[PDB]
Every structure is written in C-alpha cells, then in structure tokens.
Amino acid sequence: MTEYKLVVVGAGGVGKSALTIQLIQNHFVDEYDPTIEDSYRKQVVIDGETCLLDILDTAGQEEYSAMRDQYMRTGEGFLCVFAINNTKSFEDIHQYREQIKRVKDSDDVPMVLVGNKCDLAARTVESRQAQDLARSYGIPYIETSAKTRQGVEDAFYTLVREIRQH
Numbered sequence: 001m002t003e004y005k006l007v008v009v010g011a012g013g014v015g016k017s018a019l020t021i022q023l024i025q026n027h028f029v030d031e032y033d034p035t036i037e038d039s040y041r042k043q044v045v046i047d048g049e050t051c052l053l054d055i056l057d058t059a060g061q062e063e064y065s066a067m068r069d070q071y072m073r074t075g076e077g078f079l080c081v082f083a084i085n086n087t088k089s090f091e092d093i094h095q096y097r098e099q100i101k102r103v104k105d106s107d108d109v110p111m112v113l114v115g116n117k118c119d120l121a122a123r124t125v126e127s128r129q130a131q132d133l134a135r136s137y138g139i140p141y142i143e144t145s146a147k148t149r150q151g152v153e154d155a156f157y158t159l160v161r162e163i164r165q166h
C-alpha cells in the first residue's frame with residue numbers, strides 16, 4: 001500500500017502534537033509537553049485508497065533538535081501549523097517554509113497551512129490574512145481545532161491530496 005510521509009512543523013505550543021494525537025488517537029491533549037521528535041503511524045482509508053500515514057511530529061521549541069532538518073528530509077508533505085491566537089507563530093511560518101524548501105531542495109513541496117486553535121476566541125490572525133499567505137505559497141489554508149476535532153481530518157487528508165497532485 002501507499003505510505004504518505006507527513007511532517008508537522010511550526011512554532012512551539014501551536015498544537016502540532018495535539019493535532020497529530022487527535023488525528024491518530026482520537027483525544028485532545030490538554031497539557032503542554034514540548035516534543036523532541038515523535039513518530040506516529042496509522043493505516044487509514046482516504047478517498048477509497050487504503051493509506052499508511054507516517055507522521056513526524058517535530059519540535060517547535062527552537063532548542064530541539066539542532067538538526068530537526070535531518071528528520072524532515074524524508075518528509076513528502078508538510079503541515080505548517082500556527083495558532084490563530086498567536087501572531088508570532090503566524091509570522092514564524094515563513095521560516096518553517098524556508099526550512100522545508102532547504103531540506104527538500106525544492107520550492108515545490110506538498111504543504112498545507114494550518115491555523116490551529118480555531119475554537120479559541122482570542123483571534124489575532126484573521127482567516128483572510130492566512131488565506132493570502134497560503135495563496136502566495138500556492139497551498140491550501142485550513143483552520144483546525146485539536147480540541148474540538150474541527151478541520152483535523154481535513155488538514156491531514158488535504159495534505160495527502162496535495163501530495164497526490166504532486
């Protein structure tokens with residue numbers, strides 16, 4: 001069967017782990033334990049295709065892992081996550097995309113921009129602002145909440161469908 005190597009990247013605390021764990025394990029992680037480098041694998045059916053999803057959950061805290069770049073190298077698709085209540089995380093996105101371009105040696109890499117924590121009312125990143133950024137990259141923008149599950153499958157499945165267009 002087809003394996004899709006997904007990598008979740010973005011600033012510390014934006015909800016990368018929560019999103020991944022919501023997708024794979026169907027619960028919300030309320031606590032904040034900073035990730036070093038975690039891997040998740042799950043067989044899923046996406047658009048009638050039995051898929052193996054191999055998801056790399058990366059560090060957002062810029063202490064780890066000096067060379068997060070080595071883990072990202074095999075990544076076929078990248079979820080670029082910021083939090084809609086964290087302007088800095090949105091501003092950090094460009095640096096994550098540049099790192100992706102670096103590790104893949106290409107400006108044409110399957111990606112989805114994810115505005116997470118959309119259940120929160122303290123929005124400082126408006127949808128249109130992120131839509132415009134995504135448009136400039138030629139990628140979809142999807143809002144998600146790891147807490148409510150809203151958009152979670154949409155974000156990950158869309159990334160799969162982006163890899164398929166590649």
Ligand SMILES: Nc1nc2c(ncn2[C@@H]2O[C@H](COP(=O)(O)OP(=O)(O)NP(=O)(O)O)[C@@H](O)[C@H]2O)c(=O)[nH]1
Pocket residue numbers: 010011012013014015016017018019029030031032033034035036058059060061116117118119120144145146147148
């Ligand atoms: N309300 C709400 N809280 C969320 C959401 N996603 C994550 N959180 C919360 O945000 C905190 C950080 O989430 P986490 O997934 O650990 O972030 P991370 O991006 O993996 N962090 P790191 O980069 O350090 O590994 C946790 O307390 C988690 O419950 C969301 O969609 N909504």
Ligand SMILES: C1CNCCNCCNCCN1
Pocket residue numbers: 104106108109
């Ligand atoms: C990453 C960059 N791709 C640019 C060239 N396209 C064909 C390669 N597909 C696998 C690499 N995917």
Ligand SMILES: [Ca+2]
Pocket residue numbers: 027028029030
């Ligand atoms: Ca919980």
Ligand SMILES: [Ca+2]
Pocket residue numbers: 101102103104105
């Ligand atoms: Ca390179």
Ligand SMILES: [Ca+2]
Pocket residue numbers: 124
């Ligand atoms: Ca504003």
Ligand SMILES: [Ca+2]
Pocket residue numbers: 153
């Ligand atoms: Ca479902």
Ligand SMILES: [Mg+2]
Pocket residue numbers: 016017018033034035057058059060
């Ligand atoms: Mg994490």
Ligand SMILES: [Zn+2]
Pocket residue numbers: 108166
């Ligand atoms: Zn390619």
